[PDB]
Every structure is written in structure tokens, then in C-alpha cells.
Amino acid sequence: LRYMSRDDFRVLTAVEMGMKNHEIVPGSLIASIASLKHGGCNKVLRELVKHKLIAWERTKTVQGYRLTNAGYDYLALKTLSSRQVVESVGNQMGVGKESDIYIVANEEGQQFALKLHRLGRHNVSWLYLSRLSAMKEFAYMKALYERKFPVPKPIDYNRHAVVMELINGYPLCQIHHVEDPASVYDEAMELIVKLANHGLIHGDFNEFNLILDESDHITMIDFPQMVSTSHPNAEWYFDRDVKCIKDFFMKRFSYESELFPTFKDIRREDTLDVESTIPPELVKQKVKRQLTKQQKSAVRRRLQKGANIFTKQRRENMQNIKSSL
Amino acid sequence: STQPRSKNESKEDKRARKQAIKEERKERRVEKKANKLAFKLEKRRQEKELLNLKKNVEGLK
Amino acid sequence: GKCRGLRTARKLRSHRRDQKWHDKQYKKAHLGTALKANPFGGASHAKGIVLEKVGVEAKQPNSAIRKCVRVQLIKNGKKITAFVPNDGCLNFIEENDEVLVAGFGRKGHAVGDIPGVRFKVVKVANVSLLALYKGKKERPR
Amino acid sequence: SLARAGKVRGQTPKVAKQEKKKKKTGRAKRRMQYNRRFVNVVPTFGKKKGPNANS
RNA sequence: CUUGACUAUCUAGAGGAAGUAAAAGUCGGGUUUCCGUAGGUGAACCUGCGGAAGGAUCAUUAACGG
RNA sequence: CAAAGUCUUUGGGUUCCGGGGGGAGUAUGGUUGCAAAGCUGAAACUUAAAGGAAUUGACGGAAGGGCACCACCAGGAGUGGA
């Protein structure tokens, strides 16, 4: 859990600065880009390694620290706490293969759902691929919610985290019986035509990507796989999804279709496939920026001398040599 | 002034147009020197106001 | 290189004196700018009056709070930040008190950990800090 | 914000000093420093032990 | 000693502009390295002009007279 | 590097010039300049270092190389669905 609420923000963000440019980030660089407190961040790092926040690396010459799976996760929740969306943790967790679903609660007590991307090449690239995944998923989630679709409501995105509306139900794959099979079938068939009207094909529109809300309402999740209708094989992915639903309701619920929708409508809706002259006050601002940069560069070099680990290794062997003489 | 010098223009037309650009720049490097002394006087007084802190008004109690 | 004449004395000596001014030590000693800007002003010790207790935050790696005392000297009236030595020696010094201040050791460098502090307290109200810490004397007021 | 004054002096358990027999001074002390270093020599293979060396 | 001119200092000061702790208070990708100069909103940096390397040379190279 | 040699075995004549890094080639004064500027030119203060040559190669987001059914290809059997 999150007890520590000051220095842990600045140090962990400084890791993320080095993670975007380089692999394993040395402890010398950290203190320079976290200039607010000097010297005492090395004991914070020793508290970070107690948790699954950072990992140590001392290979051959490469000495420093890299950010972990769980350590990257804490940074998003710390940002979402400042945006007043997350406060306490709900325990119902659906541990998946591509992502983890965590129930969150705000100041109000209103329960929302949180997605955390767990893509698993070094861990540096893996925690950058999860960054692009959340930004892409939130883009479609905003695009569909605005265009009348029955999707979870987008709230906030932070690096790899996506806060969505809490739609609680069961996935279609583990459903025994539906009270009204025909009305549910026609609802689902409409949604393929709906997407095709907006110039989109789901691609993998199966029973593994559909959730029933009280056996009345079909909910759609997971959107990184989506393709344009400008694609040469546009009608193939359209017909494969139709046949997947046609056979499933005939298999599980024994409902045969009276309606066979094969309409190509592109596009009647929004194309979502794309988805003395200088005043003294300015002189002050400009002189200030110069003076801050001179001090910041000097503080970097003071912090780069922290090597403290190099001095500790050299001292241990000298004591052994003198005693043996 | 951004006028392309046309071929049929003679003396008095060319000569006054050149003298206009000369006077723009003369007014311009006066304005640049003025800023150069404005920044020089503002850096030097902020150097004092920061070096003042090193000596006094920095610490705790 | 060097002129090595027999009548070259005046060239030599004059050159030596001219070059002597680029030596940091000599210039410091002889120009009479450092002897005037020095708050002590050619003094082993000064005596001042305490204005406030100032906890100076230590220079980067060594992270602590160095307990200094902002004296105002008597003999001219310059302000000084002055480090009070051993632990719990700050407690002896009270505001508006006589204090004998001395250099630190390096003639104008901040010594080690403390930034911009050149001076240390030696006596509080005519009794030594070293005695008061070691419980040898009592402090009047 | 933090900053105690002489915390570690006032937290240490005040251990009273032991009463030992007095030290010899001057020429007497030098004598004892001489005979402890050059007179009663105890043989060692390579000499790795110091004078104060506690273990 | 008095009278002015140049100065030097010591000491009172409305107001100005600051800075400093208190308020979580309201909102929110490009670059080889340079040098001198001119311009681009001061500096940086970029560009024009003239310099540098303080920048990583493969290969070919015997006749040439009827 | 045949001078960058003939230097603790240190003196052929002679001119200019450097003395930890910064602040700073900045202020100020003088002077030259139509101007832009040039020459001359500090201190207060700050800092344990700024740096030069060489040497192994932790890491390349290097390029190449080669290796493995816990990699692929050609395949067989599955898991994942009850």
C-alpha cells in the first residue's frame, strides 16, 4: 500500500525520465534531476527495493537501477490520487494475460474499474509498449462513447492505466442460458453494422470479447486490434464475425437466425478508422531562467559524485590486505 | 520594407528606398543596444539579490 | 626565454614584480581589498552580539542541519553566520549575548560541510564553549 | 522541521568512570614505555599484532 | 571665520522596485566539432559570409612508338 | 618531436607572455572608434577540483557474426473451450 507520500514521487519520476532515453539508470543521475532534496535519496532507494518498486543492476560496468512491473504501476495510481479519481482499493481482481483489472474507489465511495497493462526484449521496452497501448485503447473508448456505442465510459489515462465505468457482469463464453435469445442476438448484429457504419471492423468479434449486463445489455471491451474499412479484405473480417455469432447462438442456446445482415455502408457516420521594446517583467522572467539553469547544472555535478558504492568496495579489500601482511 | 527592386526604377526611386532601409537598421541596432543594457542592468541586480541570500536570510529559526 | 644579461637587473626585477600580481596568494595579501572586505579586518578573533539562531542546511552529500548563530560584530557592525561547534552547544548561546568568534581554519573558505560559514564561536559571555560543554564552568547572563 | 540540539548527548546512558590506580609520570613513564617495547621481546613469525589491538 | 564651486564622508528618511518563510489557498524531436563577425526579440541557439580539423584515404597510376 | 634534441651533467643572445577552475575577458575608469565595436581591464563572492595524454572494454538504440525444436521453418501431439 501507499504510506509514503513525498520523496517517493520525485525519485520514481526521475527513473521514468532515464527509462525513456536509456536502459538501467545510474544513481548518480537520479539526484540531479530530483534536486529538491540532496544526498538522502539513496536511503529512499533502499526503501524502494524493499517493495517491488525498483530493481538493482550491477552487471560488469553498468551500475544503477531500473523500474519494475509493479513499480511502474504505483506511479500511475499516485498521479490518479492527485487527480482525485482513486483513493482506496476494491478487491475483485480479474488477472488476465495482457492486462489486470483492479476495482478502485474515489472520495465519493463510487466504485470504478481500472485497467493496468502488463505486456511481457528488455523490461525497458516492455514498460514502453504498455504506454502506447493505454493511449490507443483510451482513444477508441472516447471515440465510441461519444458516438452512441454501449462501451465503458472513459475517465482518465496515466501512462498505462485506464479508468473506466464499472459495468459488472459475466463474459459470454461462460453463459448457460439467456431468457430472450432473439433480442440479444439482434442487439449484437446491430453492433457489427454500427461499427461498419462508422468505418470500423472489430476483427476478433467473438464470445471472448463480449460481456452481458444482467442478460439484457451487451458490453464491448478490448480495443487495440481494430482495422479500417479501406483494407482490401474488409468484407472477410466482417463476415467471419457474423458467422462466429450465427453459429454460437445456434450452438449454445439453439437459436437459428431469421435475419441475415450483409450490408456494406461506408460511410454514413463519422470515419473513426482515423482514430526598450521588451517589458521589465519579461526581462525578469528571462534573467530568472538563466540563473536557475546555471544553478541546476552545478547541482547535477554535485549529485553525480554520489560514487559512494565505488568507495565502499575499495575499502573492504584494503583492510584484508593490511591484516595479512 | 519588402519591395522587390524593379528594373525601370532609377535614381531618386532606388536612392530613397535604400536610405529607408539604412534608417530602419540604424533605429534597430539602437533598440538592440538598449535591450543589451536593460538585460545587463537586470542580471547584475539579480546577482546581488541572490548573493544576498547566501550571506543572510537562509536557514531555519 | 629569460634575458641573461649583466646589465639586465632592472628588466628582471620589474618583470618579477609585475608577474607577482597573478599569484592568488600574494594579490590577496597585498592589494588591500581582502583586508578591507574581511569582517574581522586583520583579526584573530572578533567579538559580536547574537541576533538569531540559524540552522544552516548542510552542503549536499552529508545531510544534516548545522547549528549556526548569526552574529553582528561590535567593532564595525558587519553581519556574520558563525557555526557553534559541539552537540548541544547551541543551547548555551542565547539571543542578545556577547560572543567571541574566530576563524574556522582555512582563512576564508567554508570548512567542509557548512556552506558560506567561515567562523566559529569560541566563548559565550566570557566563558569558553569547550568548558561549558565539558561542565567545567557556569554561564552568567 | 526536525533539528534537535544535542540529541545524542542527552540520550546516552551516563556511565560513571572506573577508579584505577594512578599512572606513573615523567621519567618513570618513559622507563615503562621502554621496557614494554625492547626488553621482554616475545617471538612472533611475521608480527601482525598491534599494541592496543583488542582481538 | 564667512561667502559660493568642486568634491569626501557621517547619519535621518514618506515612497519605489525587489527578494525571502507562511497559504497542497484559484487556474492550468533535432545535433560532426568549432572560430570570427552581421542579422534574427537580450544571451543562447539558428542562419549568411570567410576560416579551421582539434574529422575514419579505398582503388588506378611501367608504352606513349611505324 | 631530427627538433619539441644538445635541461638537476640545469646559464648562446634576446622579445612577448601563464601561475587551480569559475565569477569573466563581466563591471568600472581611460582611450580609439560615425556606429557596431576594439585595446587596456578588476574585485566581492563561489568552488575540490577544470583538465592532458595514454589503457582495458561494463554498453551500443553497432553493424556483422554464429548458436539452440526449453527458437523458428517442414511437421505430429496438445493446452487454452466442457
PDB file of all heavy atoms in Angstrom, chain E residues 37-39, chain F residues 36-38:
ATOM      1  P     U E  37      34.005  38.921 -33.058  1.00  0.00           P
ATOM      2  OP1   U E  37      34.539  39.498 -31.793  1.00  0.00           O
ATOM      3  OP2   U E  37      32.785  38.061 -33.014  1.00  0.00           O
ATOM      4  O5'   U E  37      33.799  40.128 -34.076  1.00  0.00           O
ATOM      5  C5'   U E  37      32.481  40.531 -34.454  1.00  0.00           C
ATOM      6  C4'   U E  37      32.280  40.339 -35.934  1.00  0.00           C
ATOM      7  O4'   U E  37      32.633  38.988 -36.330  1.00  0.00           O
ATOM      8  C3'   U E  37      30.846  40.466 -36.414  1.00  0.00           C
ATOM      9  O3'   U E  37      30.401  41.813 -36.469  1.00  0.00           O
ATOM     10  C2'   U E  37      30.942  39.795 -37.769  1.00  0.00           C
ATOM     11  O2'   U E  37      31.588  40.632 -38.698  1.00  0.00           O
ATOM     12  C1'   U E  37      31.823  38.591 -37.430  1.00  0.00           C
ATOM     13  P     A E  38      29.212  42.309 -35.504  1.00  0.00           P
ATOM     14  OP1   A E  38      29.482  43.725 -35.144  1.00  0.00           O
ATOM     15  OP2   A E  38      29.016  41.309 -34.420  1.00  0.00           O
ATOM     16  O5'   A E  38      27.944  42.242 -36.455  1.00  0.00           O
ATOM     17  C5'   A E  38      27.804  43.174 -37.534  1.00  0.00           C
ATOM     18  C4'   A E  38      26.722  42.707 -38.465  1.00  0.00           C
ATOM     19  O4'   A E  38      27.137  41.459 -39.072  1.00  0.00           O
ATOM     20  C3'   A E  38      25.384  42.403 -37.804  1.00  0.00           C
ATOM     21  O3'   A E  38      24.617  43.598 -37.778  1.00  0.00           O
ATOM     22  C2'   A E  38      24.782  41.353 -38.729  1.00  0.00           C
ATOM     23  O2'   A E  38      24.083  41.870 -39.845  1.00  0.00           O
ATOM     24  C1'   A E  38      26.023  40.595 -39.195  1.00  0.00           C
ATOM     25  P     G E  39      23.591  43.853 -36.588  1.00  0.00           P
ATOM     26  OP1   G E  39      23.163  45.277 -36.672  1.00  0.00           O
ATOM     27  OP2   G E  39      24.208  43.354 -35.322  1.00  0.00           O
ATOM     28  O5'   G E  39      22.370  42.891 -36.960  1.00  0.00           O
ATOM     29  C5'   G E  39      21.508  43.185 -38.082  1.00  0.00           C
ATOM     30  C4'   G E  39      20.781  41.954 -38.564  1.00  0.00           C
ATOM     31  O4'   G E  39      21.707  40.870 -38.828  1.00  0.00           O
ATOM     32  C3'   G E  39      19.785  41.335 -37.601  1.00  0.00           C
ATOM     33  O3'   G E  39      18.566  42.065 -37.598  1.00  0.00           O
ATOM     34  C2'   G E  39      19.625  39.930 -38.172  1.00  0.00           C
ATOM     35  O2'   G E  39      18.697  39.799 -39.236  1.00  0.00           O
ATOM     36  C1'   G E  39      21.046  39.626 -38.648  1.00  0.00           C
TER      37        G E  39
ATOM     38  P     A F  36      27.335  51.651 -30.753  1.00  0.00           P
ATOM     39  OP1   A F  36      26.132  51.549 -29.884  1.00  0.00           O
ATOM     40  OP2   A F  36      28.624  52.117 -30.166  1.00  0.00           O
ATOM     41  O5'   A F  36      27.591  50.239 -31.450  1.00  0.00           O
ATOM     42  C5'   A F  36      26.510  49.455 -32.001  1.00  0.00           C
ATOM     43  C4'   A F  36      27.053  48.354 -32.885  1.00  0.00           C
ATOM     44  O4'   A F  36      27.708  48.938 -34.046  1.00  0.00           O
ATOM     45  C3'   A F  36      28.117  47.456 -32.259  1.00  0.00           C
ATOM     46  O3'   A F  36      27.540  46.417 -31.472  1.00  0.00           O
ATOM     47  C2'   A F  36      28.861  46.941 -33.484  1.00  0.00           C
ATOM     48  O2'   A F  36      28.198  45.878 -34.142  1.00  0.00           O
ATOM     49  C1'   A F  36      28.863  48.180 -34.381  1.00  0.00           C
ATOM     50  P     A F  37      28.073  46.140 -29.977  1.00  0.00           P
ATOM     51  OP1   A F  37      27.101  45.241 -29.301  1.00  0.00           O
ATOM     52  OP2   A F  37      28.424  47.447 -29.353  1.00  0.00           O
ATOM     53  O5'   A F  37      29.395  45.280 -30.215  1.00  0.00           O
ATOM     54  C5'   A F  37      30.651  45.640 -29.611  1.00  0.00           C
ATOM     55  C4'   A F  37      31.685  45.857 -30.688  1.00  0.00           C
ATOM     56  O4'   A F  37      31.459  47.151 -31.320  1.00  0.00           O
ATOM     57  C3'   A F  37      33.133  45.889 -30.209  1.00  0.00           C
ATOM     58  O3'   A F  37      33.682  44.574 -30.155  1.00  0.00           O
ATOM     59  C2'   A F  37      33.796  46.783 -31.250  1.00  0.00           C
ATOM     60  O2'   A F  37      34.200  46.125 -32.435  1.00  0.00           O
ATOM     61  C1'   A F  37      32.697  47.820 -31.503  1.00  0.00           C
ATOM     62  P     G F  38      34.590  44.121 -28.902  1.00  0.00           P
ATOM     63  OP1   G F  38      34.636  42.633 -28.881  1.00  0.00           O
ATOM     64  OP2   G F  38      34.136  44.858 -27.695  1.00  0.00           O
ATOM     65  O5'   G F  38      36.033  44.677 -29.284  1.00  0.00           O
ATOM     66  C5'   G F  38      36.713  44.198 -30.457  1.00  0.00           C
ATOM     67  C4'   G F  38      37.894  45.075 -30.771  1.00  0.00           C
ATOM     68  O4'   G F  38      37.448  46.445 -30.942  1.00  0.00           O
ATOM     69  C3'   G F  38      38.954  45.164 -29.687  1.00  0.00           C
ATOM     70  O3'   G F  38      39.828  44.038 -29.685  1.00  0.00           O
ATOM     71  C2'   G F  38      39.638  46.484 -30.028  1.00  0.00           C
ATOM     72  O2'   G F  38      40.609  46.411 -31.053  1.00  0.00           O
ATOM     73  C1'   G F  38      38.447  47.336 -30.472  1.00  0.00           C
TER      74        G F  38
END
